[PDB]
Design an enzyme around this catalytic site. Sequence first.
Site, PDB file in Angstrom:
ATOM      1  N   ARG A 165      -1.067  -3.298   9.097  1.00 13.17           N
ATOM      2  CA  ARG A 165      -0.757  -4.717   9.094  1.00 13.17           C
ATOM      3  C   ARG A 165      -0.406  -5.206  10.494  1.00 13.17           C
ATOM      4  O   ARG A 165      -0.804  -6.311  10.877  1.00 13.17           O
ATOM      5  CB  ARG A 165       0.349  -5.056   8.087  1.00 13.17           C
ATOM      6  CG  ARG A 165       0.130  -4.473   6.679  1.00 13.17           C
ATOM      7  CD  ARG A 165       0.564  -5.407   5.547  1.00 13.17           C
ATOM      8  NE  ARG A 165       1.776  -6.158   5.875  1.00 13.17           N
ATOM      9  CZ  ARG A 165       2.340  -7.069   5.081  1.00 13.17           C
ATOM     10  NH1 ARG A 165       1.799  -7.338   3.891  1.00 13.17           N
ATOM     11  NH2 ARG A 165       3.445  -7.713   5.469  1.00 13.17           N
ATOM     12  N   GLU A 183       9.277   0.072   0.589  1.00 13.25           N
ATOM     13  CA  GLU A 183       8.261  -0.284  -0.391  1.00 13.25           C
ATOM     14  C   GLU A 183       6.881   0.143   0.069  1.00 13.25           C
ATOM     15  O   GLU A 183       6.062   0.617  -0.724  1.00 13.25           O
ATOM     16  CB  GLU A 183       8.272  -1.784  -0.652  1.00 13.25           C
ATOM     17  CG  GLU A 183       7.503  -2.181  -1.899  1.00 13.25           C
ATOM     18  CD  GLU A 183       7.729  -3.627  -2.298  1.00 13.25           C
ATOM     19  OE1 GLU A 183       7.704  -4.506  -1.398  1.00 13.25           O
ATOM     20  OE2 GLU A 183       7.928  -3.879  -3.512  1.00 13.25           O
TER      21      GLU A 183
END
Lengths: 51, 376, 399, 376, 405
Positions: free
Chosen positions: D208, D199
Amino acid sequence: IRESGSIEQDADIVAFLYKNIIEIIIAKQRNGPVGTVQLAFIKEYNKFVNL
Amino acid sequence: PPQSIEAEQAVLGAVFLDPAALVPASEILIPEDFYRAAHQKIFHAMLRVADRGEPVDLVTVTAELAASEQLEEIGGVSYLSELADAVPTAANVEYYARIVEEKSVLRRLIRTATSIAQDGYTREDEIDVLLDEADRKIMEITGIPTGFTELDRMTSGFQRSDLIIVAARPSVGKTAFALNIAQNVATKTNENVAIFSLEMSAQQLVMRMLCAEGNINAQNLRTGKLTPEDWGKLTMAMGSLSNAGIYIDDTPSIRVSDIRAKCRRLKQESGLGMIVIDYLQLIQGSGREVSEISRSLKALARELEVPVIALSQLSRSVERPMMSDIRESGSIEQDADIVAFLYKNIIEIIIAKQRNGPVGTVQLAFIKEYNKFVNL
Amino acid sequence: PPQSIEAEQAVLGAVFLDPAALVPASEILIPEDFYRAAHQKIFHAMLRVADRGEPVDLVTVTAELAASEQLEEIGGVSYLSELADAVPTAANVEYYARIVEEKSVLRRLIRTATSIAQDGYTREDEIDVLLDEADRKIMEKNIKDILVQTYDNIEMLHNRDGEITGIPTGFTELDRMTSGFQRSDLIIVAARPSVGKTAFALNIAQNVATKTNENVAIFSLEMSAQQLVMRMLCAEGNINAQNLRTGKLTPEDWGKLTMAMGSLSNAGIYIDDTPSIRVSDIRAKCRRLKQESGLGMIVIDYLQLIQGSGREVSEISRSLKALARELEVPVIALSQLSRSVERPMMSDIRESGSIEQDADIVAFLYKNIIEIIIAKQRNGPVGTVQLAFIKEYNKFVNL
Amino acid sequence: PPQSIEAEQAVLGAVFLDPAALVPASEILIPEDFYRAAHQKIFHAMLRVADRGEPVDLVTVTAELAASEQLEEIGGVSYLSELADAVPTAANVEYYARIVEEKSVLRRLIRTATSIAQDGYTREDEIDVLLDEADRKIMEITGIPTGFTELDRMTSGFQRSDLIIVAARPSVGKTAFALNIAQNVATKTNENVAIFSLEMSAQQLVMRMLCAEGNINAQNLRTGKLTPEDWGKLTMAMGSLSNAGIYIDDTPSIRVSDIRAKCRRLKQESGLGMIVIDYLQLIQGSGREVSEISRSLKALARELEVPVIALSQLSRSVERPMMSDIRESGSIEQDADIVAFLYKNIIEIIIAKQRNGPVGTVQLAFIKEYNKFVNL
Amino acid sequence: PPQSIEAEQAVLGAVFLDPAALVPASEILIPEDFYRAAHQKIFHAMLRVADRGEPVDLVTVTAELAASEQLEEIGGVSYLSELADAVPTAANVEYYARIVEEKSVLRRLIRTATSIAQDGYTREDEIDVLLDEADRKIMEVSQRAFKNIKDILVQTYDNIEMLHNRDGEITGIPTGFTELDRMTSGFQRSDLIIVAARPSVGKTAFALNIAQNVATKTNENVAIFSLEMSAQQLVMRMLCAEGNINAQNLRTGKLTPEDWGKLTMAMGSLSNAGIYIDDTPSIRVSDIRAKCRRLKQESGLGMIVIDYLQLIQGSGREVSEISRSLKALARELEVPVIALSQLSRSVERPMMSDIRESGSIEQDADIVAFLYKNIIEIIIAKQRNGPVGTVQLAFIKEYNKFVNL
């Protein structure tokens, strides 16, 4: 009874049945009113009587 | 057979030459316009290439002809170069484009006409249908006050020759809205209103406007029931309604020509002022499509010089409506020179399109008991 | 046998005519890609010369062809002249390149396929090796380098500074990242219903046409022309939107409108509110518009509404990028997100692809404050630019 | 044309002989695998008699052939007797069955290949489609420590060959939970981790974990923004993340075979220890179903002797998760030998199923600014 | 003209060979079923002999044929000889019978059907009678193996002994469970043994315990196929069960220093065992067969245990073909094959129907066993050679073991 139609149109009068009292719901009538007539049911004799 | 080989060659050869000449051609011609089978192929691949891409020239086009192996199926390349070396000046082009288009047009006229004749011997049979798929196939406060002060402001109000389209989801009350307009026009102004009710019967329709007119509780009549003075109220309704010039046609599914013929006769016999059609998606075609009906309803407005109000139903996209909710069920959008949507027992009237005048939201109140729209 | 004799001649002769047209050709070919051996020779000899030196014209090539005595082995110089004196256009070339390159590749599929076939008769034998080496011929990430590139982005957001090389958006912070919207780019802005993607597209269109001297073509498939003007009149002169809808209007809010109209009339905004258009129509109209008045931006109100060439979505996407390249103009296409979000990301338009590739820049929209997530940009950073939204005027303003 | 007549006759005759030799013969072959029209029919009839009933021998087979009136269509029974009397021993068969199979599969190569060549002149037209459908056609604490002390208590921790399944509703933070684990393993232990993000892109993923590693405010990077010492904080994060054995594959939609072949290469080239898959529902099948993927991921786990963490997404039944919320999207329940759910910035890790260990809730705290899970 | 001479020949021949074949023959055929006159005569005569007397073979049958002066009317005796030849197996007499029988109902269908067609031209005349005799005539085919105490109590007695007769020689592979070994004797070569239980009952543990008991105690090699559980996960259970180590103690580890010394003895003992494991997720049967096939002929094989059947995939990309193949597997390798199975939620004491809704394992298996106070019950509901009943064992959760009683 519309999921199991098309009795809805052909019938010019459709009545439903719903305290040992029972209700007679006249949902459709081509010449006349639409409402609830009420009658009393006796289980012992299998009868509907007036009120 | 109407055709211009000479002037076809031009368009093909002018695109090889300029070649920014393919633009003014692609706007005026589409491959099926070209008469010679071969020419279709070229102008097609020549166009197919333009969809990358990439651009267009003598070479690139041959590639795309060999791609679909329809090179040696035209002439050779020998023909592609002929086309080029044939036209000296490629500024005319468009043109040229309009000479091939005319020859393309006639061939369809010559065709759709021969298709109608051919039908007059294979059917016999239909007529009231054949005479429709003949129309349809050959098709290829300054105005009337509404009675709703705020709507008249914006519209001015409904004017002659305008096709007015009022779309709403089921249960919103488009039918009642149409009827209130038809009723206000017939009772207040001296003008005649023709109503086509395709879903609802004539008497079933009057029964609603009788409630509306004299303020009788709708369910009171349905279930009758009736207050002795509410009954007096009805007699006043009838009276006021009798004088109005309302003409109803409750034929289940009519074709547009039948609607045209009946409105045609009425204007020239008593006088016509409005035409109200209870929902468009119910009008059947000239076969045994919705664009051709829309197109013909606008023509109906132009011919009789009368505002036609055609109700429409919205797609389940909303679940506030907008133009795309009737577009997926087009092409009513263009033909209509005014599109209105329906959306606290208060209702909103969103005028999304108007050809002469503003776009906004007029607000009215709806009373369920009388099936009426009232001012605010 | 696949080939394009004619399109080969084009590449070759197209070098002889520029010849800054060898650089592009050599990126997209190698002498083998050329069918006719005679060609193979030239394009090699041509490349051998680029390895000085010295430069690359007729003379120098005929020297190099004779240098391996394969001059008269082509046609002659008589033919080399033909290559050039044939093909008249070489702004293409590149092309041309991909034509000859497609036809080479096919010529290989056939070859390696027919070899797999031929082998099915000799061996009988191996099988588990044959059906392994069947793959092989029918076929013809580490963290060191990711970090290395991330710092190039983590800055790339701080770096910025500062020249706006494209078309200014009017939104300072969005210009920082994009620089801003540039010619030939297919810009896709996707957002769920009600987030305000249509208002975003309009603000951009408006800012461009009012501030800069450029012309903006807007295709509103959902909303009508006047219904669209109404929203940019509100946004221009600061008129309460619901005030106009229900009208209503303060006498000086009315004077506010006359100033809005005046300033908006000078702008080069061209609208087409045709409810469901095919790409070709969009193309033809933009095409005429640029060569008649001058085009700078194309803005399309939602992609999913454009119908195809029938009576699919990837072809439209592909054709929009094309449109961008042809008119040398940024094309801003709005898109609608799937109900997967219910913060958007790439997969939310990948289930409705293949827009992801064709677009060189993909933007999502997500306190009356809004976020503009740039998830993809081919030449520039990736991140989130933040703007403030004012419902009453239907505007996006800086921060 | 690849073919072993002799081998076929063996298989057939060998059934008439034993005939418990039809069992391995059907396990290996099906009718079409036989080149000879005739045999095809026998080995079918034979098999059709296998499906009652009744069982199979020289009589019952001729009985079935007469039935579909294709007895004299072979040879006589004369030929059937020839089949039984041609081969002496049925101990082989399987075989024989496999010789026939090779020859079968070979003709299916010549076939699917010749097809491609043939296509190379019809299309031209496609390329990227031909180069796709070319592959398509031709392709036919005892464990690893998680860093979360309390999770490790229960699991001990993630152990070799185990398919671990982490399910969560959107926004709960499954991705962040997978990432933290993947990161903890790479940085703290010496083992390599393979991450498949279907994704989210590779850089978007590192962004992240960079935030998670050195404690950098995530919205600060996105909007950037950044404190001159927050900036130095990044340089420490990078340095310490560089030494880690993280391998990321951000291909949009992979088939499980690709996942397998990639990990296979990685184990034998540098050494593998974990496999993390960012959401299962995103993996596409062997077509152009979810149970076969789940089965294949267990397979993958067992082949590489490495715990496979596959994130899953929960149905809208929750709106505290349980087993029935992924059972309606089964049959992942069985294949997984450990199933975990995610449910005050504090999060709950519900371990619903574990094959060799307890079942309960482990509790961790989630920090939204850094996108991290921390101990308690 | 529907017929099967091929099949007829068998039945007739098959009698000559057995001739305890002639009983199941008659229960399914009567002379007319035979299409060929010649045969009709034989089966009849053959039967007319059974009515004595006397019994039935070549001589006695040619006797009865010359008796009704219809010997040379068949063919010769040479044809009675011939017949005895074209019967492949005498044990399949009844399947050959039904072939003949099916072609004989068919014929009558066709006939009585054509007899209706034929009628709709002569009568015209009747109609309501025609449509009534139309049903009748067809329904009169629909009409054209019932079981009576006298035998059901011969077994339901002989059985009710065997449970007590036992004694006591373990002919097959010993289980380790002395009470199971009494009944089974124990698990023998070529037998397909099916152990079925609902989840959480402990079938896996039960399979493992046997596997373990066979490999450690006897010299035989076991081949375990665990399609659900991984090889190390499985070993962890039989280490627990061998040296008596608290299962949850290893899981959460935890470990008593002398419980640690208890492990080293378990490993040793278990290293000498001949346990081979394949933990492949989902295998086809062909793969199970080729791996066992190699192992027998390379090191020697004695037992195959498959952790649950419904996990085995087929030859596609049905459960019956798997069953059937597993029995063949057993026959080829001359080795008991223990296939675990799961029960349908009908139980919620198990019986045959609980796997019959998920059949057809019931037939192929020559032994079916169900599992049902930390005591467990082992119900043996089917055994081809031996008694039927319940053996009991005790289960210890902490070690995951089954022990004797």
